[PDB]
Amino acid sequence: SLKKGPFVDGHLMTKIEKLNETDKKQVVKTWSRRSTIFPQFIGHTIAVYDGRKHVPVFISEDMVGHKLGEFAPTRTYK
Amino acid sequence: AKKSMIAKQQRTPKFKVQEYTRCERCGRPHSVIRKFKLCRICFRELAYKGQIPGVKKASW
Amino acid sequence: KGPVAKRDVLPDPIYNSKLVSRLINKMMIDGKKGKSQTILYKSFDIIKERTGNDAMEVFEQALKNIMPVLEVKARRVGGANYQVPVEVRPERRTTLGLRWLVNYARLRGEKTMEERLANEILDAANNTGAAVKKREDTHKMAEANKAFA
Amino acid sequence: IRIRLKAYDHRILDQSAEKIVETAKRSGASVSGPIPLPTEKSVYTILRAVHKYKDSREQFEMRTHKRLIDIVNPTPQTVDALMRLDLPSGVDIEI
Amino acid sequence: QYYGTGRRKSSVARVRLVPGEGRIVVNNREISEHIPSAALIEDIKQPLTLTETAGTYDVLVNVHGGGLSGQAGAIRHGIARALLEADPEYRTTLKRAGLLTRDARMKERKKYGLKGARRAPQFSK
Amino acid sequence: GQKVNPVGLRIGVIRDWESKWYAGKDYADFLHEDLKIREYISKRLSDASVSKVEIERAANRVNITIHTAKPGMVIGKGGSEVEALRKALNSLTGKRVHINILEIKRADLDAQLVADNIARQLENRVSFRRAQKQQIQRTMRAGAQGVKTMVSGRLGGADIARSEYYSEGTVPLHTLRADIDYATSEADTTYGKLGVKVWIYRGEVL
Amino acid sequence: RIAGVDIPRDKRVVISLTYIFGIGRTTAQQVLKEAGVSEDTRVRDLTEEELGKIRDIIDKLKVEGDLRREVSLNIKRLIEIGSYRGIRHRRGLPVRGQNSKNNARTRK
RNA sequence: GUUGGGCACUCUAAGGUGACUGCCGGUGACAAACCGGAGGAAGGUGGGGAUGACGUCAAAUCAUCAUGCCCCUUAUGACCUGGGCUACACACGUGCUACAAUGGACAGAACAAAGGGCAGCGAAACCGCGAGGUUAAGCCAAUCCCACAAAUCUGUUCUCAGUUCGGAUCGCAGUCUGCAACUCGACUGCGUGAAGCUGGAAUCGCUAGUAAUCGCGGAUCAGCAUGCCGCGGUGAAUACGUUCC
């Protein structure tokens, strides 16, 4: 991902822009972990699928340059 | 799972990168040679049975 | 089975000796005769410079000091672990001399193996030196175990 | 008119080489001879065993060798002779 | 122009001995311009030193293949062959020196299950 | 870990290719078309006892030669056999198919038909000594300098399966000018799967 | 000394400048071209002109405590926000995605 | 070598010839064979490969395949996304890189083999520090490309230190492939720079173009190689011997 742009899925972009056209709501259950965080996501609590559950994460100013799956480890260890 | 997996490979998937090479005679991936479109063990069998018009035993 | 033998190349463009090319094939690391030839000729040019002599005769004198008469082989009978002294046949005298030159030269430590080989030849000429410790000690091991022959 | 035969057997390609050589030589086309060109061969190494034994292999060999034929004088009698040469599937004429 | 081919270790040299004074010309370059490490220069000159050929032929060499010691072997083999074609006399001298052998020591083919055509990988029990 | 198959060992020395053409641009596709051909034709004529199929590829045309050891089961009444044989091949391949059927005189020297003849008798519940010895007498009278028939599997004996050699004459698998027919066949019986391996040293070429 | 930390007097300039936290070899060669010391001098042998140009060029560059404090800020940032890569920063398990049943022995 | 020209030469690939203890001498029974010699490119199965006897381990493979029997069946079968097979306190096989002056860095000069390329190989030019990028020649290939070989050799430089050794780890910035590189890709650029100064008991490989070392290639494959499979480059040391394992 170099100069083509950042990446997001179109469905998650659709859900977030429906959320952003009026105001925030409940969590978004989203299996996409592959997608970067645009600055327009900030404040939207979204539920990333780790493999077996939907973990809710609240997006801040810092949590932008990374992706969604950085905030859900998939492997439980001790 | 053999005829299902063979059928799934014989399809066109959603993406070209989901496409992988497969047997064409004895259903398995892992070591399908691109030239013969054949699995490794089936290549040894058919190349022993006088088919596959190029290959004989190698020595140099 | 039976014994098999090997060969070696006669000249060196300066210092025309068999055994100096035998030392060239020795101390060769990783298949580089070029580096060992460079080390050898720069070392013998130091031996020609630092002592105003031809380095052939100094090199043979160093060999003569190092070439061991008596190896001490092994012979374990029962629980005894005896070492038995062997009159060395002179091919192995030259090759043990070259191994001891090369090994104790690179074991010495100076600012090139040019200098280490030069100073090890200069020490083995006037017999007291580092490889000649091994010469003396092998003759001492043969002297102690002389009861078996 | 640069006919490059390439085959798997040397004897079949020799037979199909000198057949074109003679049929073009008889009608005056000044046949430069069968220039033997380097073979492209490929080696396919294969685990013999069904399941284990990476150390146990077998090597197979596919050689395709090619020879070049040139026809220099026009002599279209030779072209009509080449069009009716029926030589087998082993050799792959490509003019 | 006596001509001789020399082969050594996947290298082939073409040595033509022209009647001259002793210049050796390797691919329109001279000796140390193309072969350093003068042990190869004395080994490449040995057929010309055993029989007296010291300044009676210039040498022109067209070499291809191998490496620099392989090219040295190919040049000295071509020298001995063209220098037999010069005079048939001293073939006993060249043959006692080697020089009509073409050392057939090709690099061996790597075998499967081995690292390097003799090397076993490592044994553990 | 044992013997290389002698068929695959003598390919490109004396024994020819069965599949004879040259690769243009769809070598894999020609191969697997010919695998479909050989499957279809060996299934259909496993009644009519066809051993081997040699396929040509002749610039949109395929010449299939068939070694059967009987003509009039496979060329038959003339019309019906060539109809049902060339017509379905023209369909399931997609281009022209010509069929030339060479007949094997001495039906007992081709190891494919011999191994099938031993396999059928095991499926006909004939004892596994009678099959191999009867067939060895048939082959050694049909004229062969050596025959070896080896049958393995559950021979009608449950909890131990073993290999059985019968042979007569020289079968020299190490002489690389030998001209040996090797052939396997399988026999699915009520007790499991039997494996017949027959190979027939027929004579060498100087 | 130059960035509040020493450089060795008896080395050449290109490699005495390497010991400053923030300058390796290639930024040192980018400096000494701009300064014009021609890369072949000791730093025990310079002039106050020739070393003052080195000083204020390095003063323009992000070198001494800036680098450590900002890289600690980046590490603390992705430790505090969550961020599995910072979990690897914390625990002593490798960050860039590396197998851990074997070595991983820079980190524990 | 571009052109005209030539098949001499290399090379290529077909048919040959050729090495058989054949000839000499010696030994031994005169045999079989053995030791040396001459010739010869080749000397005693010339080097290698392929070839793996009857059988042994109820060895391995029901997961390449085919399978007898037993089990499941709106599920022990099938689709879809996400994860995992990359976990990590530990042990343990195989490997790679080093610990350094026969070295490191910087500049110049040369020498290879073998193999791959059609929706693929991709020149040259341009831009970018670089990974690479844009336009595009040629190539279904002894032509054109991959492909600028590397150790090497020759100058400059450091001077024996945890360093001008080593590159781990890591932050930042990039590039390419691909719906998508977060777990989980390779590579580049800047910076950080660790353990390590030749390894206890024990232990492995190799008898010659071999070991050691250096690069190149190809399968697999969009992309991923330190693995494997081949190729060349330089290129050794030793074998008294069968006392011991």
From Swiss-Prot, chain B:
Family annotation (InterPro entries): Ribosomal_uS14, Ribosomal_uS14_bact, Ribosomal_uS14_CS, Ribosomal_uS14_sf
Pfam families for this protein: Ribosomal_S14
Disruption phenotype: Cannot be disrupted; as the protein decreases in cells 70S ribosome formation decreases rapidly, with concomitant loss of uS2, uS3 and YugI (general stress protein 13) proteins from the 30S subunit.
The keyword tRNA-binding is annotated on this UniProt entry: no
Gene Ontology MF terms in the entry: rRNA binding; structural constituent of ribosome; zinc ion binding
Cofactor note: Binds 1 zinc ion per subunit.
Cofactor(s) it depends on: Zn(2+)
CC per GO annotation: small ribosomal subunit
Protein's job: Binds 16S rRNA, required for the assembly of 30S particles and may also be responsible for determining the conformation of the 16S rRNA at the A site.
Family of the protein in this entry: Belongs to the universal ribosomal protein uS14 family. Zinc-binding uS14 subfamily.
Protein name as catalogued: Small ribosomal subunit protein uS14B
Species the sequence originates in: Bacillus subtilis (strain 168)
Lineage, uppermost ranks: Bacteria, Bacillati, Bacillota, Bacilli, Bacillales
Gene (name only): rpsN1
From Swiss-Prot, chain C:
UniProt GO MF annotations: mRNA binding; rRNA binding; structural constituent of ribosome; tRNA binding
Example of a GO cellular component annotation carried by this entry: cytosolic small ribosomal subunit
Biological process (GO), any one: ribosomal small subunit assembly
Keyword set includes tRNA processing: no
Domain of life: Bacteria
Assembly and binders: Part of the 30S ribosomal subunit. Contacts proteins S9 and S11. Interacts with VmlR.
UniProt xrefs under NCBIfam families: rpsG_bact
Family per similarity comment: Belongs to the universal ribosomal protein uS7 family.
Protein name (database record): Small ribosomal subunit protein uS7
Protein's gene: rpsG
Curated annotation (Swiss-Prot), chain D:
UniProt cross-references to PANTHER family, sorted A to Z: 30S RIBOSOMAL PROTEIN S10 FAMILY MEMBER
Keyword Hydrolase among record annotations: no
Protein name, entry field: Small ribosomal subunit protein uS10
InterPro entries: Ribosomal_uS10, Ribosomal_uS10_CS, Ribosomal_uS10_dom, Ribosomal_uS10_dom_sf
Pfam families linked to this entry: Ribosomal_S10
Family, as annotated: Belongs to the universal ribosomal protein uS10 family.
Function as written in the Swiss-Prot or TrEMBL entry: Involved in the binding of tRNA to the ribosomes.
Biological process annotations from GO: translation
Extent of the signal sequence: none
UniProt GO MF annotations: structural constituent of ribosome; tRNA binding
Cellular component terms per the entry's GO annotation: small ribosomal subunit
Keyword vocabulary terms for this entry: Ribonucleoprotein, Ribosomal protein
Subunit structure: Part of the 30S ribosomal subunit.
Classification via Gene3D superfamilies: Ribosomal protein S10 domain
Ribonucleoprotein listed as a keyword: yes
Superkingdom per UniProt: Bacteria
Encoding gene, per UniProt annotation: rpsJ
Curated annotation (Swiss-Prot), chain G:
Entry keyword annotation includes Thylakoid: no
Membrane-spanning residues: none
GO molecular function: rRNA binding; structural constituent of ribosome; tRNA binding
Keyword set, alphabetical order: Ribonucleoprotein, Ribosomal protein, RNA-binding, rRNA-binding, tRNA-binding
Superkingdom, natural source: Bacteria
InterPro entries in alphabetical order: Rbsml_uS13_C, Ribosomal_uS13, Ribosomal_uS13-like_H2TH, Ribosomal_uS13_bac-type, Ribosomal_uS13_CS
Chain residue ranges for the region called Disordered: 91-108
Function: Located at the top of the head of the 30S subunit, it contacts several helices of the 16S rRNA. In the 70S ribosome it contacts the 23S rRNA (bridge B1a) and protein L5 of the 50S subunit (bridge B1b), connecting the 2 subunits; these bridges are implicated in subunit movement. Contacts the tRNAs in the A and P-sites.
Xref: HAMAP family: Ribosomal_uS13
Binding partners and assembly: Part of the 30S ribosomal subunit. Forms a loose heterodimer with protein S19. Forms two bridges to the 50S subunit in the 70S ribosome.
Record protein name field: Small ribosomal subunit protein uS13
The organism of origin for this protein: Bacillus subtilis (strain 168)
Gene name linked to the record: rpsM
